[PDB]
Design a protein around this nucleic acid. Sequence first.
RNA 1: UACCUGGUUGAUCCUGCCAGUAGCAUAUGCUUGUCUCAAAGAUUAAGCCAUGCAUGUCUAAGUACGCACGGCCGGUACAGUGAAACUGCGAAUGGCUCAUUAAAUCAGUUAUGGUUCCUUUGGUCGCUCGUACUUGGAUAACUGUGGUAAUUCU
RNA 2: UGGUGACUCUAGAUAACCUCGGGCCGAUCGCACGCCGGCGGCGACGACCCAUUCGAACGUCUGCCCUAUCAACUUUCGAUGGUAGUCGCCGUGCCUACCAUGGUGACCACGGGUGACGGGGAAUCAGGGUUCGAUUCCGGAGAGGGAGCCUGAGAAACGGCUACCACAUCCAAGGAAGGCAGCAGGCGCGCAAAUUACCCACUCCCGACCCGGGGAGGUAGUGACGAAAAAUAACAAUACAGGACUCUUUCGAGGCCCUGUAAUUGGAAUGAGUCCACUUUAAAUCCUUUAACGAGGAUCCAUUGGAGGGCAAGUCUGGUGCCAAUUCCAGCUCCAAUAGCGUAUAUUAAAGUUGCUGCAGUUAAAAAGCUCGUAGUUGGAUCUCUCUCGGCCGAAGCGUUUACUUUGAAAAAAUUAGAGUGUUCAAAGCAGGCCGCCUGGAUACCGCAGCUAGGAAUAAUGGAAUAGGACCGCGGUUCUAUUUUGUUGGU
RNA 3: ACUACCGAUUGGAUGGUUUAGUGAGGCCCUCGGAUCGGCCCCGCCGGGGUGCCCUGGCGGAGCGCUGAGAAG
Lengths: 180, 262, 50
Amino acid sequence: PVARSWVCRKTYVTPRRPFEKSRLDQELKLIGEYGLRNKREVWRVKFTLAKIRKAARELLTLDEKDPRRLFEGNALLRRLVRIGVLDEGKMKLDYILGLKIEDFLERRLQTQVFKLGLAKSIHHARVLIRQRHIRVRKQVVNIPSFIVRLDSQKHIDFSLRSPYGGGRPGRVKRKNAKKG
Amino acid sequence: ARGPKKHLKRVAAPKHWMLDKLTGVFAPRPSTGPHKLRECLPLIIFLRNRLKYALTGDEVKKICMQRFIKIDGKVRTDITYPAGFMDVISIDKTGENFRLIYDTKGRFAVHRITPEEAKYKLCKVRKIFVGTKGIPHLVTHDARTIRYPDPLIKVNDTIQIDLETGKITDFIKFDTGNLCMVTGGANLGRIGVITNRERHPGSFDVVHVKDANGNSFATRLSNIFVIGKGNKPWISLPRGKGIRLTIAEERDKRLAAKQSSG
Amino acid sequence: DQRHRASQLRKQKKEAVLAEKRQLGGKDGPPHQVLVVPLHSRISLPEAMQ
RNA sequence: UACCUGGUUGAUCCUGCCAGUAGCAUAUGCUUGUCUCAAAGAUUAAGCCAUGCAUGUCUAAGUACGCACGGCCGGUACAGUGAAACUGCGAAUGGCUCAUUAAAUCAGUUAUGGUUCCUUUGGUCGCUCGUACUUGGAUAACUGUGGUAAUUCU
RNA sequence: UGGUGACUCUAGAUAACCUCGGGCCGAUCGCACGCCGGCGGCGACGACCCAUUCGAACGUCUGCCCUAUCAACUUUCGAUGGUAGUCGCCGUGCCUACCAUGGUGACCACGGGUGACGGGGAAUCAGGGUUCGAUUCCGGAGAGGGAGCCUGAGAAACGGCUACCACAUCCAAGGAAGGCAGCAGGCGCGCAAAUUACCCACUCCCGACCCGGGGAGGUAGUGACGAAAAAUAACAAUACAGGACUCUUUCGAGGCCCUGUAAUUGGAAUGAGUCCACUUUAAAUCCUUUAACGAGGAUCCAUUGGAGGGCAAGUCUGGUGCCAAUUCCAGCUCCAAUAGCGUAUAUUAAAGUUGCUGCAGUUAAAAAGCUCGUAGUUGGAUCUCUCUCGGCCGAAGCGUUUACUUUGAAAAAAUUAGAGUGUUCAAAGCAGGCCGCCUGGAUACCGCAGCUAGGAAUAAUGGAAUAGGACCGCGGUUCUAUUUUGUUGGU
RNA sequence: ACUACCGAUUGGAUGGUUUAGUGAGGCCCUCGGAUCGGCCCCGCCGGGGUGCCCUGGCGGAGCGCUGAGAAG
């Protein structure tokens, strides 16, 4: 008897076969293109996509006017549209089976900081977010994997206390300007 | 065990109390009283979790034993006193009155009532017997014994009783076509008119009830509380009128409410 | 039979360990000799011995 | 994601098992910057235990002549606070462990029209035709004398 | 009178009884005091009984692993049933007396074993399954082993008592005390597991109680069990190496771009740390928030394993021995994952190597000399709703009974699936959102068995063939009407 | 020299079914009666209705009547 919860889940699955060249090359491609730390982040996003595809196939086995199929398919499609992975006009459970890992990778905060020109590269974007230079609508975010919603796409701003933002300079600039 | 239990674990508490997992290992454990353990809302959960005058159980004790809370017109200072269906809670200091009646989801709604409606309550008659020197008694659902009832009042009927005195003031028969509210089972909280009662001797009767929207649902005879005569309830009802919406129309109503405001 | 056999083996081993632990430092054996070694210079050995 | 790689023969195919592979558990090895949760003497010994703590409790409302304190007003029995002690209640809940135990336990379902139930809540409590404007004896705490190496002994 | 589906129910009447180890019918305590010596309002505490609540305790139906190298067991000593009682809170072979000889079993009894507490549940997952569930929720059991009590509403109680058994503490030798499978801690055992810490602030519990107490519980300590998030560098100029595009047939030119590699330069940005102050909190720590210091080999230095036989990855180097091949040792290079990665053991999946789904048996594991031959398993075709009483309906017999299928009710939470919600993200949590108000705390699943109401294909089953078979009326015999012989005797 | 089996000694100890016998301790019953109190009797005696009675405190004996009750 403790007032503690023990509920937790693993957020990835390891691949079944360890050393396959095509899978290794595809994972390395996605790591390099999206500036990721290791293979586990690719496996995490792959796990999320596999769970969503399993939910879509399960709802596709149901008949069209099943209330659970309509309710849960509508909720799943609404979530996928809300994080920008699917288009608003493609709200249909068949198109979920055509989704790719690259859309979920593009909706990360690292990729959006790169694509909105706040960073000169994807690795610059990662080190920018990690060092409290980025805010999303009011809130400083450190997490590169922060998945951005379409309502927060236009509010990625740039940290009103950051030296490149609000203006108060960093440690190096005060130390170097103090010499002379 | 070697004797009766005094503790209720929090995960083993009744789910409609809406307690969380991480506040403690214990739940408030209702006292013995006019209601069952699984079918009551203790006073500490009402004053702290629902109505939010208090932040801790110690503040609940400080509220209750200043003699502010009346249940059915009687001052109670037991913080775990089991209050249940149709019970009137009166706070004279803030001028508030409540009846503990169910939501459409089976949870005790915070239902505010008028101070003239707090003068009375309804009770379901659970037994009729004749005691010594030929004196008829009825026993209600909240452990009330009334001597000399009307000879027309039977078991499953509903008495309208005056909390100032405790005597029978009016009554409603169990009949097909009267309004009822479901107080147990899977249809807890729904309201409708009785359309058919089928009888199973040596077993449980099954009452069929039809909603005001035309939906039909059955329950046992134990789960039926007759509220109003024919079609008009004799007490105030919550915001939902016993109409259980499905998850689709509840989502639609939530989206329309979000669209209208915001 | 298994329970009683395990009981016998446990009783044997515990008796032997009791004899072994009682011989040292008790009234039928030699004193328990403790060598105190400080491993650093800031350590006050006299305070430890007091 | 209903996936595989290799091992017998001069070489080909096969039965067949094995090794690699992935998850879960325990242990252990090496290594280890930050932050959030978080299991943790079960397995072998329901083996054995030094020491300390784990269950006590008073309101206006059972009993106050402990000056242990404390204002009266003075015949005003008892202001008030209150150690001790008697009385009442609780200590049958909680916590631990998994030895036992194989239609037993337990689960779902039914029954008490075959029983008990402190407590809470409601009813009943001039329904009996027969010293009371208040009854009797003690016993603690307290005082005083003690016994035993030793006890929450007396 | 009143009730049930059914009473030997509830209530009523009569005759009495009513236990001295005795059944109720108040010699109790506080606060405000007021009316005509008498009348009184709030309470507190007790209280026989009735109901309720919290239970408990005995029963019903269905459901459990291995074993035949356990095939008959129970029955004098209760085994199965009857009658009367005893005891018990009550039903009962619970026990006693007398009877009957019964009860269970190849549909696996009885016996034994389990590295067996049972479930909710966990791992895997196409599906069926397979393995795990000592362990925080629910139920049970036990407090060294047995046994027996007291008190109490409740215990066969062990942080109660009394013995014996096994251990064991003190002693002046007479005596006295004992029970960590509570919290810490120790020894032992082992491959195997944390501090003799702080606090009742939270959750709740107990008590005469707003006030006291709680190793329940909370909070720190240890903790790479495991799960989540996530640093160990980024950019610009320059120099080389490529790839585009303009101009040239090309070589080539691009102050034309793009992308890489740096014993090359350059200041910008930051955490890790050190350390005021807040915040946090019972008091603190941590986290968050903030001053100050804090980065070039940013030495503020990432590890663990494997490769020269197959999945990822070697035409390498040097020592040391045997007759260039060849034992042992140390390196280099490459590959994998990464704050983590190897190893052992068990198990699961690959696995269709336990096969119901779904395997095999000529020649590879394996089909019996042949025929007859219990049980079990399996079995051709065929057969298209009504009668009475009460307001077109309700009650009633069902129609052979099933098996099968569907519906309805009823069915702890947690976990699982899943809806909502910017925990800074996430694993989580049950929250929150808007300028007092507005909302949430859904929903699904929940085998089997048992209740409920339908369906009639499939598969059993039965209904007349020695006719003592239906449907009608005529009947004869026996028992039998509760009332239509005002009150009655009635053959 | 090592590993692994048999083994006379009813070898010694321990346990589980049992035959026969003994049996602590509690509980119940039938006795028992250490002690403790009341009534009756009497003595020291206060008042009244005017020596009949009783009122209250102390003591004395009576296996008289009894009630509670420990060990065994």
